[PDB]
Structure formats: C-alpha cells, structure tokens
Amino acid sequence: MSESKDQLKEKLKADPSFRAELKDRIKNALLSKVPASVPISYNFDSYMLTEVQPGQLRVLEVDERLVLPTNTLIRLLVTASDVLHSWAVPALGVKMDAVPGRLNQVWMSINREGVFYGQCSELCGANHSFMPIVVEAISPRQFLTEYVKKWIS
Amino acid sequence: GETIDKYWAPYFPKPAADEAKKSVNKEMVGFMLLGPVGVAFMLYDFAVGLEEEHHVTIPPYPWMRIRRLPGMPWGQDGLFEGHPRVATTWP
Amino acid sequence: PFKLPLDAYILMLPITYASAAFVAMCCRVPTADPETSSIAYYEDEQKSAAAAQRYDNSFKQFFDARIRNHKVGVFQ
Amino acid sequence: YRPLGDKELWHEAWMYEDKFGTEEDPIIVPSLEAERIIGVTDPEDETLVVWGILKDGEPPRQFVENGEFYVLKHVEYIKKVGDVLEAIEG
Amino acid sequence: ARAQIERWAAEHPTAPRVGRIFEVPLGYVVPRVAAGIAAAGCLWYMNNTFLQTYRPESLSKEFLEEQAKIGEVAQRMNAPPVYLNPFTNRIPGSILGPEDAKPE
Amino acid sequence: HQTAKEFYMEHIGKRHPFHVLPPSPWPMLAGWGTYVSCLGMAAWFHNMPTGGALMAFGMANIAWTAITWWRDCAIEGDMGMHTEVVRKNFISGMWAFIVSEALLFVGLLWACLHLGMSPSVALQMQWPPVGIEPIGWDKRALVMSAVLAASYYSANVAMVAKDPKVVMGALATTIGLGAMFLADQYLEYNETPFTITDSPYGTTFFVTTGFHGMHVLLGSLYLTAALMMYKRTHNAGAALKSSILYWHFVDIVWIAVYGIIYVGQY
Amino acid sequence: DSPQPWQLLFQDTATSTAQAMIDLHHDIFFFLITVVTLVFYMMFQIITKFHYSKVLKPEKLTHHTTMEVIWTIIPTLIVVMIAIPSLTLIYSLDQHTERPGLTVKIIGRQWYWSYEMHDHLQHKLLDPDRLVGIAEKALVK
Amino acid sequence: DSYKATDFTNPKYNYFFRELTARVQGVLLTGGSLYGTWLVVFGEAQR
Amino acid sequence: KAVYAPSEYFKYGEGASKHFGFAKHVAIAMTVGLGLSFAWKTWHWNEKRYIAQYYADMARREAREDAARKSALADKYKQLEEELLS
Amino acid sequence: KPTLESLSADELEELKNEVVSEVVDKIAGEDGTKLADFLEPELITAPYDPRFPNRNQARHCFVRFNEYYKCLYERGEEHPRCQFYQKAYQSLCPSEWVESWQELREKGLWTGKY
Amino acid sequence: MRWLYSTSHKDIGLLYLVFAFFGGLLGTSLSMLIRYELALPGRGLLDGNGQLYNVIITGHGIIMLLFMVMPALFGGFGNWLLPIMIGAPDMAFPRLNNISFWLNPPALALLLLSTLVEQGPGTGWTAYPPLSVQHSGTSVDLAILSLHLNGLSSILGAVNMLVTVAGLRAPGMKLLHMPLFVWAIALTAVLVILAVPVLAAALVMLLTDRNINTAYFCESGDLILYQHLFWFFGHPEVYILILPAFGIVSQVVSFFSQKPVFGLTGMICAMGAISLLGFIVWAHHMFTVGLDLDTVAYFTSATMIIAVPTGMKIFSWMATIYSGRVWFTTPMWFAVGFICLFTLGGVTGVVLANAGVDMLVHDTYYVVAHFHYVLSMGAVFGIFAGVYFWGNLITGLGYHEGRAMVHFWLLFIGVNLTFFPQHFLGLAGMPRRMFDYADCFAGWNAVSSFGASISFISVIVFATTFQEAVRTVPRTATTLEWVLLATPAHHALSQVPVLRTASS
Amino acid sequence: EKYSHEEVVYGDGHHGLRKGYTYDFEHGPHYLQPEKIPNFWSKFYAGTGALYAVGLGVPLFAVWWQQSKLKA
Ligand code: HEA
Ligand code: HEA
Ligand SMILES: [Cu+2]
Ligand SMILES: [Mg+2]
C-alpha cells in the first residue's frame, strides 16, 4: 500500500541490481519527457539588391542570404532548372556548375564566422552579371538554438 | 597522240592473264557465300512489308514525343510516320 | 623517316604513361557503378556497395596516407 | 652513275652522277633555260641545304664550302634517267 | 646564310646597319610612340567623360565618406557584425567584430 | 588555242609530270550556293514561308555546280592530262577524306556510347526507355548485313579483274546491291515503332542510320559515275579505284554502326 | 571574403581546402619565378653578347646532346614534383568521413538563386547519468 | 570518232555545260541570295 | 680561276663564345631566380604563420565561452540538487 | 497489506512505474518543459550511401524515393524503415523533382512495379 | 576574273591574307566596345543591355579565333609558301584550293548576319546548351552554320596541304630537308583533319536539338556530352592556331642569326609530341562541371606534360640565337618578343592545369589573361613577324623600318598593359563574360581599357608602314623562296629544282 | 572551236596584256607589278581606307541596329 512503496525504497537501498534497474527505469521515463523530432524546412529565393546603402557592396549584395553554421560538415546539392549556372564563393573555395538534371554535391567545413561574397560563374543570359551569392556563417549553437526555430511551423 | 600521259608513260611502268581469273574466282567464292541468300531473303522481305500491324499504344511518357518547339518543320506528325503510336486522350 | 634523337624517348616515357593512363581510364568506366541500364542493380545492396567502394578506393588508396598527413603542397 | 635501284625513273639524273665536281673537272648541269636553281647539301652535314643559281656561259661555281663545282649547259632535252639510259643499259 | 642577309638588306634599305642593338634611333621612336600614347589617352578620356549612361550612386562622395566611416565591416541578420577579410587587415583572432570588441 | 597545246607542252608538260589547271568558275559558284542553301535551311527550320523552296534551290545549284566540276574533271582525264603520280595523289586525297568522314562517325557514335551506357533519372534510369520497342538483330538488319557484305565482295571482284565485261557486271552488281540496302532501310524507317522525337535511343538511331544511308547513296552514285566512264573507253583509272575505296569505307562503317546500335542496343 | 581595390593575389579563406589550393598555387609560382628569370636573363645576355658588332662570323652549333637531355629531364622532374600534391588535393575533396550536419539544395534560375532545406531537429538530454544519480539520491531518501 | 550523242562529255555539249550555266547560275545565285537575306533579316519565325 | 664559296662559320669554341662563359651565366641566372623565389616563399611562410597564430588565438577565445557555459550548467545542477533536497 | 515478500512481478512493476513517475513529473514536468537547459539539439540529415560514390547524386535521390514506396507497399505505412526512407529522400531531393514524380505517379506514368 | 577564278596558290594565299586582315579589323572593332563598356563601373555605351554584350563577345571571339589567325597562318602563309619551300610547281588540287578560300566569305557573312536577326546569338563562342537551344529566332542557326562552313573550308584545305607535302616534293628532297614551317603546316593539317569533324558532329546534334525536337542535349539527354565533344574539338583547335607561329619564328630566328636551327630533329619531335598530346587532355576545360575525381586526376596529370616539348622548342630557339651573328630588325623583334612573351602565356597554363587551383580561377579573367598572352602575343606576333619578313616577296611592297618599329613598340606596350592587370582581377575573383562589376575592381579595369586604346592606335599605325620596294638579284640562300625574284613569276620554278646529295 | 575540249583543257591561248593590265601577270617575270598600275598609290590608300572603314564600322552598325529595335 504505502509500506510496500517504502519497502520498494528499502529494496532500492539494499539491492544494487534493483537500484540500477530502477535507475534505468528513471532514465527511460525521462526520455519520454524529451520532445519528439520536428522537421526544419524552407524554400526562399535570393535576389540582388538594386539600390544599396553605405556599408553594403554594390552588385554583390542580396536580399536573402544563406545561413550556414561553422565547424559542421555540410552537404550542398547544386542544380538548376532552365539553363546552366555556377555557384561560386571564392572565400570558401567552392565553384560547382549547376546543371539541369544533375545534382552535384560539395562537402564543406567552415573554420570561422564571417560574410562571404560570390557571383555566378557560368554564362546564363542577359542578367548573368546580376546573380550574386552571399553566405552568412554563424556558430553552431546559434544556428541550432535560434535560427532553426524560425522555420518551425 | 602527244598527251602528257603518253609522254610520261615509259617512266611509270605497270607492276607486271589467268592470274586475274584466279583472283576473280577467289573473290567470287566469298561473293556467293553471302550473295544469293541475302538477295533471296530481301526479295522475301519486300513482299512481307507493310502488311502486319501493331496496335500497341504507348502512354505519353516525358521522353516520348518531345515538343520543345511546337509541331515539326514539315507538319504535325513525324516524317516517315504514318501510324502514330503515342496515345492521345490519355485516359 | 629520320633517326629520332635522344630527347624524343625521354619525351616518349611520359607520353606512353599518359596514353596508358588514358586507355585504363576509358576501360574502367563500363566496369563502374552508375553504368547500369536498370533500377534492379541497386536492389542488391551488398554487391552494389561493394562494387562502388571498390571503384572509390582504386587510385585513391595510393593517396590516403598522404591525405591524412596533409601532403597537399610541395613545401609545408 | 649511282645505283638506279630505289630511284624514280623520271628524276633526270646528273644528280645521280658518280663524280665529285672539281675546279678542273666540274659537274655539267643540263638545263632547258639559261638559268636554273639547284640544291646542294653540306658535305659535312646532310641536314643543311644551300640553294644556288647557275647561269649559262659562266665559270665553275662552288655553292657550299668544300663542295662540288658546277657548270650549266643549255640543252633541248634532259635525259629522264630510269627509262632513257638504263633501258639502253649500255 | 650571309648572302640572303645581304640580299634582304638591299631590298630593305631603310633598315640601318650601324653597329647598335636598336638600329633605328630612339629620337625617332620615342616622340611617335608618345604621340600614339597621347592619342590613346584622349580616346580613353573621351569614353570616360562622354559615353556613360548611368553613373552608380555608390561612387558619389557622400556614399564614399559614409562608407569610409564604417570600414570593412559586414552586418549580419542573425549575429553581431564582423570585420571582413581579417588576414589582410590584420585583425587578431580574439576580435571578431566591431561591437563585440567593446574597446577598453 | 592550237599553240596553247604547244605552249603547254613547251613549258609545263615536258618539264614535270604534274597537272596545272586553267582558271575555273566553279569554286565561287559552289561557295555562294552554300550561302543560299544555308539561308534557306535556317528559314526552313522555323517554318518561314518559301523557306524550304529556297533551301531546295540552293541545294540544286550546289548539285549542278558539282556535276559540271566533275564533268570537267572527267574531260581532263580523257585528254590524258593525268599521269600516274597524279592518280596516286587522287587516291591519297580520297584517303584523307575517308579519315575525316571516319572521325565524323566516331563523334556520332560517341553520343550513342555515352547516352546508352548510363541512363539518367529523367528516363527513370532505364535503357532502353519504357514504351520503346528496339529493332532486333535477328531480322531484316541481318539481311542488310548479308547484302552489304555481298556488295563488298562484288566490289572487290571489279578491282582485280582484267576482263572489261567482268568489271562492268561486278560494278552493276555492287550498285544494285547498294540500292537494295537503301530501299530496305526505307522499310525500316516506315515500320519502326518510334520516332526521332521519341527518346535519345530513337534520336541516336535515326541520326546515325540516316548519315550512314546518305553515305551509302553517295557511294552508289559515285560507283555509277565510275561505271559509265568505263562503259565508253574501257578505262577508268582513279575513278574506279577511289569509288571502290569509298565503298569499302562505307562497308567498314556499317560494322561499327550495326555492332553498337543493333547489337549493343545503344 | 570580399575583394579589395588594387588587389594582386587571392582573397582570404574560411576553409582548409581553399587555403590548400592557394598554397599549391604559391608552390607552383615558386618554380615559375625561377623559370622566367632564367629565360629572361639568358635572352638578355644572348642578345647583347652576340650582336654583329661583336661577332666577326658565327659558329657552327647545330646540336648539343648533353644540354638537350638536361633541359628535357629537368622540367619533367618539376612536373612530377608538382603533380603528386595536386593529385593529393584532388582526392581530398571528398570529406564524407564525418557525420553530415546539414543539407542545402541550391537551385539556379534565371535570374535568381533559390535555396532549400529539409532536415529534422531532435533533442538529447545532455549527460543524463548525473541526473540519473540525482534522481537515485532523491528516491533513496 | 570517239564521241556519241549519248555521251555526257560530248564536246558539242561544252557550251551548254560550261558557258550558259556559268551565267544563268551566276545570276540565279544573286537573285536567291538577296531574297534569302531579306527573308532572314526581315522575316517572322512561326516556329 | 673559278667561283669559290667563302668560309661561312667558325668551329664552336674559337670564335665569340670562348669569352662568353655559359655555365657562369647559367649559375648567375639560377642564383637570381632562386633568390627571388625564396623571397616569395619567405613571404608566403610569414603569411601562413600569421594565419596559424590567428586560429590559435581564436581557439584560445573559443575555449573560454564554453567553460563558462558548463560552469553555469553545473550551477543550475547545484540549484536543482537542493530543489529536490529541500 | 501485500508486502514486498508477498507481491507478484506485475504489481511490483506497476509500483516501480508509480515510484519513478511521481518524482520525474516533479523533476522534468508532465510534458517536459523544464529540461530546456539540459537538452542538446541535433539536426538529422540523410546519411552517406556507399552505393553512390560519385558527385552526381540524382540516382541516390531516385533510389531513396523508390525505396520509400517499396517500404510502403511491403511493410505497412508506419514502419520505422519507411520513415527512414521518407526522411532520406526529403533530405536530398529538390521539391520540384518530388512534385513532378508524384504527378507522374498520379497520371499513371510511373514505370515502377508497385 | 583573276581574283575570282584563280587556280594559282600565290593568289589564293594573298586572298587569305587580305581576308584575315579584314577579320582582324572586325574583331578589333568588336574588342573596343568590350573595353569601353568595361572601363568604368555601372552602365557604359551599351545602355545596360546584356544580351547585346553577349552578342558582341560571341561575335568577337568567333571572328578573332576562326577568321583572323587561321586564314592568316594556315591559309595565308601556308598556301603561298608551301609549294615554293618544298619545290612543288603547284598544289595537288588547285580548284579545291579555291573552294577552300571561297567558303570563308559565306561563313563570315552568315556570322555577321546573325547579329542583325532577332536579338542576336548571345551564347559565347563555345555555345553551351540549353542557352543555345533556349534562344528563339534564327540567329543561333546562322552562327552554327557559319561554323560548319568554316570547318569544311579547313578540312578541304588540310586535304590539299597533306597531299601536296606527301606527293609533290622536289627530287632528292626527303622529309628531313624541308624547313620547319613545312613541318608545322603538315602537322597542323593532320590535327585539322582529325579534330574538325568531331565539331561538325556536335553542331549537327545541336541543330537537331534546336530545330528537330531531338534528345541529344536536353531534359532526357546529357549536357556534359556537348562539352565533351566540343572540347575534344576545341583543344586541338588552339594548337592548330599556334604551330605555324612556331614555324615562322623558327624561320625568322634562323635567318637573322646567320645560323641553322638548333636541334632540328628535336624541333620536329617536340612539334609531334605537342600534336599527339593535344587529343588526350581536352577535359581540362571541364574541371567544375561535376566529373569523377579519377577523371579530374588523369586530366590534371596529363595536361602538365605539354610543358616539356614547348620548353625544348623555346630553349632550342635561344640556342639558335646563341653563338651567332645577329642583326636585330623589325621581324627579329617580333620573334624575340614571341619567345619572351609566349613564356608568360604558358606558365599560367601550368597553373590552370592543376585542378585544385582551377577551382578558384575558372571563368575568371586569369583565364582571359592567359589566352590573350598565348594568342594576342604568340599568334599575332607570329603573323606580324612574317609580314615584315616575306612582305616584299608576297606583295611587292617594301616597308619603312622606323614606322614599323613605332608600330611594334605601340603594340608591345598596349598588350602588356591590357592583360597583365587582368591577372590580378582574376585572382581576386572577377568573373568572365560580365559587363557590370563590383566597385573595387575599378583600377585594373581602367588600366586595361587604357591599354586597349594603345592597341587600337597601333592597329591604325600599321597601315602607314607600306612603301615602294627595291628589287635586286639573288644568287644563294638556305631556303628556296630567297633565290626567287620579288615578286616571283605566275608559274614560279619554271624548271623543277632538284636536291643533289654530294659524295660527302 | 571556242568550245572544244582543248579549250577546256589548256585554256585559251592568249598572249600579251589581257584587257586593262599594264603588265603580263601570267607570262611575265612577276605576277604582281605594283609600280606599273597607273595611280597606284592613290588607289592603294583608297582601298586601305575603305577596308579600315568597313572593318571598323560594321560592328557599330550592328550595335545601332539592335538598340534601335528596343527603342521603339
Ligand atoms: C585570336 C585571339 C584573340 C585576339 C588576338 C584577341 C585580342 C584582344 N582581346 Fe580578346 N577574346 C578572345 C580572343 C582574342 N582576343 C576570345 C576567344 C574571347 C572569348 C569570347 C567568348 O567568351 O565567347 C575574347 C574575349 C575578350 C575579353 C573578355 C571579355 C569578357 O569576358 O566578356 C576581353 C577583355 O579585355 C578582350 C579584349 C581584347 C583586346 C583589348 C585585344 C587586343 O589585342 C586588340 C586586338 C589587336 C590586334 C593587333 C589583333 C588584330 C590583329 C591583326 C589586325 C593582324 C592581322 C594582320 C594580317 C592578317 C596581315 N577580348
Ligand atoms: C594559342 C592558343 C593556346 C595555347 C598554345 C594554349 C596553351 C596551354 N594552355 Fe590554354 N587556353 C586557350 C588557348 C591556348 N592555350 C584558350 C582560347 C582558352 C580558353 C577557352 C575558353 O573557355 O574560351 C584556354 C584555357 C586553358 C585551360 C582551361 C581553363 C579554363 O577555361 O577554366 C587550361 C587548363 O589546363 C589551359 C592550359 C594550357 C597549357 C598547360 C598550355 C601549354 O601548351 C603551354 C606550354 C608552355 C609553357 C608551359 C611555357 C614554356 C615552357 C618552358 C619555358 C619550360 C618550363 C616549364 C616548366 C618547368 C613547367 N589553358
Ligand atoms: Cu585547352
Ligand atoms: Mg566554365
């Protein structure tokens, strides 16, 4: 009734095997308090800014950057929809062509935070000069605790 | 009678009658090895031509009947195509 | 025609090396992973993974011990 | 005359003569005109070619150093050696 | 080898043989190449001055002075700002940005 | 004119065995015919009205210019302007043209080998694509291979024969065998259950077999033109030898075409 | 990060791969400087010392087997000395020997880039055995 | 005595093949070239 | 009296290459090229030393925030310890 | 009263569950909104398949997309390996490719068996 | 009638030289619009049109590649100088030589007409799909048909050249006594015959993709296949344009040094090794398209081998000048400049061969600076070296030496100040084929646009160098065109010369 | 005559100055005699100027033509 509860506590005091088993039961019950897995997803476009302000760079500036954590192995799958393009960021040493039908992968590990600028490196038409690339590099804890919460529905 | 060919002919001798017939029969052996049988099967093929039919309609897959530009330079259907297979009104 | 001089055989050693490497690279492509005309090649996961790792490791395994030691430059 | 084996029958020999032209005995070059271009190699180097021009009615002339001497002679026919004189086989 | 040299020197009599490396004197060459360079500079200046249909607002002196106030600093939408190109401008590794420095 | 032959013998013919031509109008006309036919072809691609007629007009002009050029060459052969070394140079030029056509076909079959070996996700990685019923090797294509091998051997007969009747009959047999290779390729092009617009398989099949059929037609016409020069004077010279060389080249090309497309299903 | 005015060499780097590329470039430039210096100095000296005002008549020198073999064999050693680090750099581009932390699907259009992601975020109790022992001593008394 | 009426290389056919064609073709190429240039430069593509 | 070809070349060694000193000039060129190349490589090595010092000082900074993070976590553990013991 | 010397295994198991739950609801919460300081986040992406060693990964995308529907046909709808296949192809395949493949499947233009 | 119906090789070669000069003028005009749009940040004279800028760079690249250097070196100096140099009375096929020339004005006309149709062919000179396929209209078809006609022209010319060298040599003259220009032209013909039909097949596939709705390079095709075929053509193409320059530089340097060429067999073997290696290295243009690392590995290792034969050729030229009696004239300065400045164009090619470094500088101005060193200063200097060398023989006109030196110094200064700053732009990451750039790239762009105007001025000054000639009589030479009168007769070598081997 | 095969083969046996030439290019010592065209240096500079004009003005006309179609 309640002494059997106290007798179970006394058996916790006495038997090390029962103590370890109930410790494992506590561990199993605490894992049932952990929130379940949630999906992080987005789909946004990046356009060049027509008019810049001081502190920004002309031609190279976009409206929506790409946010990537540092010290983390990132898989980048580069592709295209209509013609050929090329994703080039000279700071990161990445330049891979975007081919309609292919899915070219890059493995990349960023050592420091910063802002990295790039442009398209394959002739794609009239506005080949106006498709810039900006990558925003932050710490992994900021990316995992603050940025990904912006994409949770 | 005084052409350039006849003028230079004694300085270009031909490299040396029944040997020609021997060579002709040697090549004619390989000719009749495949000659009459190929012609016979092709004459058989010319009479078994546009008589059989296929009614195997094909669904409009993305790789079938590519129309990046509308139509063809000579019309709607392809050239040499009298019996179009890809299906229209795909149920 | 003429007698090849002593330079041209010192030329012909890396030229023969390059021609042999070109022939080998041409030959080993239809014995690789993505050159399969079926979706049923990948339903056998053991053989597919073994063949693809064999294609990975060849000519790379001669470089792993210097990849691990950052031998990526003439000087250090 | 040099051995006419492996020589084309229309190469007009005098070029295939068995003589070294000296000052007191030059090699007589036949020609259809008053001047003609001929080519002489270096006696010490097969790879080097000197082209010279011989003129009708001139002294013997040497083109390369330590080479043959030459005198041009205007003729109406040049013996097309290979069927002209080895068909004679005199 | 000498006779073709002497023949080419007779068919080209304006080429001098005086015993110097630059056979044509520099008093002839330098003024004319200077005049050609001057004409090229005039064409370049004419292109710069009269052949522009849009001058960017990021090159005006107000933009330039307001940019020189800021320096080589990039903003972030998720973090404090950061100094751009830290190796060539010799920022030490302890300092990441302007605002995170907070000078002593 | 009567001293033109005398001047030629005095200055060119008696001095070297090579052939020096008088001035000719056909290269310029052939070049501007190519200009007109290229304009017509570009207009016919995009369905511009009276564009196909312009392309046909330019092609007809190129054909007429080439026919008159070749008639002039045949006339120059019949008047004994070509020595033996000139005919050897003719065969050398035919060998160079054969090498160029060979690399054209190498580039064409490179596409078949590339596209057939590794199908893409756009095809749902299946070669040949679903719906496409490929043409088999155990049928009319084997009859074509037999007929073209017989044409190879019959053209080989006329190269070595010395009886003129044997040469004429062998050439006529080779030409008639070549015409049966094309009249049956037309039946393949009519019975085939796919189009040049249906998948890269249909694309590569039709383009490569069409280029081969065009070369077969050119070789058959060249063998026909070499026979009529022999039907007149019982001598053809370089016209017989070069046409036989071109025909053997076409035969060798069919081996690669059959063994890559029909057997390898590429 | 971003380019600068009057810049000569590469930009600054944020990965070890790009710094390896730049170091390989500077290692190649080490050999190129010596090659260009030797060519330019020897050309200048040959030009000045063999002008016709210095030379009465030239010398016959068509071949020299030793020097031909020397300038054939020295650049081949330079080629193979360059090639092995470049081959090592090419093969080190795949770095899948870790756990990947992120997928980014970059799509190139006319005329804007498009960025995608679809991952899953899950949480894990940081060092639970200390909390397990805390619960153990909370339940034992 | 070595040419017939059927012969393609008959010298009685030399004027028609080598002189009349060199002017008829020479003006037809011009009249086709100008029309083709106008058709390409000032034409509207329907495909 | 015939037309003689003139002496057109010296033999290699007794003309105007006896005073050239080919090996000396090659040694001078290689010395100058190696000196310039070693100056360039010294500059590159100095830059790499600066990059290594930068990343070392960055790691020295980065160790400090995460020590004070786990110290704060241990302080929260010491609070929750007496939360279940009071 | 049933003591520990007289209780069975199932009643003892229920008592263990009650003893654990009544205190861990105080520690972590009934839902778990108190562990946020002791929780470590981690992002899950599709793993490296050794079957696909090249840089072009469109075949990896296509194979995972087909394996999901094979898992759905064979091992029910909610088997964990089926969600492994789903979260592996969603981590790799661009969404335009995916929606094209479902509209092909809806049209009847899919060459797969299942 | 003389210049429309010609069968002589000397007239057809001169027609090639004039047509190449016209193509150089057109390309120089198209190159000033590029450097005048690129002088300042923002929008220049093109009014912010990017399609027009793409059309301009496409037309400029195609014209300067195919219609300037190729007809000048291969069709120009080759047709004029080959039968004289070997002793042939004519070409082997004299009417084929005329249709070789007469297919070039229709090709240039179609290329210039493509600019005025629709919005033009803005694709680049490589014409990569699906950008070439997406273009509505007719202009891209005209540009590709221009490419077909030019390719057929080059194939027919190579056929004539190869039958001429093989079968019409002078008696007694083997393939050992030909000068190095003949060897260069013969190896160039071999490369043309082997490489151009691959381009013809690739462009036929492009036409069928554009117009016939086929599936060569499309959704269901393979877009890397076009780059494979195109660069398998295109890398032998750049050695086609550079081997006659090697031959010309050998002839010029040998002449004015009073010495034969050092290491003749080594020179021929180096040219042959360059010719053979040019067919197996082609995917060094495709490092960033997503090829497997073994392919990249091989093409990196194989591309660096081409440095050794070129280094032997350069050191052999320097040994040819060594221990001579050298007289520095205007063609001599165009060959010393070739040797000193082609080295700067090849050392950056070594850097571009290494694929790790090429990940940073692909499609930047480092590439542009490299290939304007090897073309504007290797091939153009070779063209201009032979104009001041053989010009009085070919045209009959002399030249003023002072104005030619003025022209040389202007060109030399204007090209070392146009493309030397383009190295620093490419190392800092400025992309190719762009007209609006970032604000920090302004200084080197201004310097490069300053150099282009000096180049244009040197183009203008070249027209003023011609003058009347003085004609003399020849006795002896080392090559067969320097015993002829200037100009030679319509049938030069009235008697076929023979080479007599002495008793030795 | 005038259409014989000998006319096709050996050409037409013309001797001397062709129509408006001042020198025999076919059978004289030089195939190009530039000091014998009357007013040679005037026509030479006229042709050079026309060549420079066309080769430097065709691209500008193409720029003007495309930009005049957008400005409509
Ligand atoms: C033959 C090769 C060649 C030559 C000589 C040149 C010459 C010049 N080029 Fe370039 N260029 C290319 C080949 C060449 N180019 C190619 C292939 C492209 C790429 C196109 C594409 O991307 O699709 C390009 C593109 C290109 C760019 C890159 C633009 C971009 O990325 O968008 C630039 C930028 O500065 C440039 C400028 C110049 C300048 C200022 C010259 C100056 O040298 C000006 C020329 C001056 C000369 C003196 C040369 C003319 C020669 C003669 C007139 C001699 C003729 C004489 C006789 C026949 C007797 N051109
Ligand atoms: C004249 C034509 C010409 C010539 C001769 C060359 C010669 C070379 N080229 Fe280039 N190239 C082009 C024309 C040419 N190229 C063009 C037009 C492009 C751009 C195409 C486009 O996209 O539009 C291009 C681009 C190009 C690329 C592709 C880069 C890219 O587009 O991303 C590469 C990569 O390997 C390359 C390398 C080389 C090499 C190694 C040589 C070698 O042959 C050079 C060899 C010479 C030397 C190396 C110097 C001499 C050697 C010595 C003095 C000995 C010392 C040397 C050592 C010790 C190593 N060049
Ligand atoms: Cu290349
Ligand atoms: Mg590229």
PDB file of C-alpha atoms and ligand atoms in Angstrom, chain A residues 97 121-122, chain K residues 128 285 288 362-363, ligand 4:
ATOM      1  CA  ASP A  97      28.303  24.200 -62.005  1.00  0.00           C
ATOM      2  CA  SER A 121      30.394  31.722 -62.929  1.00  0.00           C
ATOM      3  CA  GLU A 122      28.574  30.354 -65.968  1.00  0.00           C
TER       4      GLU A 122
ATOM      5  CA  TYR K 128      26.732  25.740 -74.496  1.00  0.00           C
ATOM      6  CA  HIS K 285      38.154  22.809 -69.603  1.00  0.00           C
ATOM      7  CA  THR K 288      33.965  22.372 -62.431  1.00  0.00           C
ATOM      8  CA  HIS K 362      37.744  29.001 -63.580  1.00  0.00           C
ATOM      9  CA  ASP K 363      35.731  31.543 -65.606  1.00  0.00           C
TER      10      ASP K 363
HETATM   11 MG    MG M   4      33.236  27.444 -67.373  1.00  0.00          MG
END
